[PDB]
């Protein structure tokens, strides 16, 4: 007597959304608060004023 | 090496008979064997070195 939403079964496809993943990730506080200095080697020497 | 002998004349006495002898050969092999080494190093050291 009728066609219910169960009786069509898989003719109705489900769908997917990125929108709860799409948030920007939490970056390092210290990499935005302070200067990032490029390095080419393990050790870099910085002179500082002393008197 | 084969070996000849001085031989008599006789239809009956054993000194009248020509000696039998043989040449022979032997086998020498090249057998290929493997010589090898592994030299591990940090990927950071490969990145920081100037050469």
B22, A16 in Cβ contact below 8 A?
A: no
Query: In units of Å, what resolution does this entry have?
Result: 2.9
* Residue B48 sits at the chain A interface (C-beta within 8 Å): yes
Cβ-Cβ contacts under 8 Å for B40 (sequence gap 6 or more): none
B4, B21 in Cβ contact below 8 A?
A: yes
**Tokens found for residue B42:** 């940090």
- The C-alpha of A46 sits at a distance from chain B's nearest C-alpha, in angstroms, of 19
Q: Which chain A residues contact residue B44 at CB under 8 A?
A: 42
The nearest alpha carbon in chain A to B47 belongs to A41
Q: Which chain B residues contact residue A40 at CB under 8 A?
A: 48
Rama region for B21: left / alpha / beta (φ>0; ψ in -120 to 50; rest): beta
Cβ-Cβ contacts under 8 Å for B1 (sequence gap 6 or more): B23
Buried b / exposed e over A2-39, threshold 16 CB at 10 Å, is eeeeeeeeeeeeeeeeeeeeeeeeeeeeeeeeeeeeee
Q: CA-CA distance, A33 to A29, in Å (whole number)?
A: 6
**Tokens found for residue B6:** 């001085």
Displacement of CA A32 from its chain's centroid (Å) = 16
């Amino acid at each position: 007597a009728d066609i219910s939403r169960a009786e069509v079964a898989t003719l109705i496809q489900e769908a997917y959304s990125d929108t709860l993943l799409a948030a920007a990730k939490q970056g390092s506080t210290v990499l935005s608060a302070f200067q990032n200095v490029n390095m080419g080697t393990k050790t870099t020497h910085l002179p500082v004023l002393a008197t | 090496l084969p070996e000849a002998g001085w031989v008599g004349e006789s239809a009956t006495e054993p000194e009248g008979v020509i000696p039998t002898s043989k040449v022979t050969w032997a086998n020498r092999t090249l057998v290929a064997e493997e010589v090898a080494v592994i030299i591990p190093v940090p990927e950071a050291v490969i990145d920081d070195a100037t050469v």
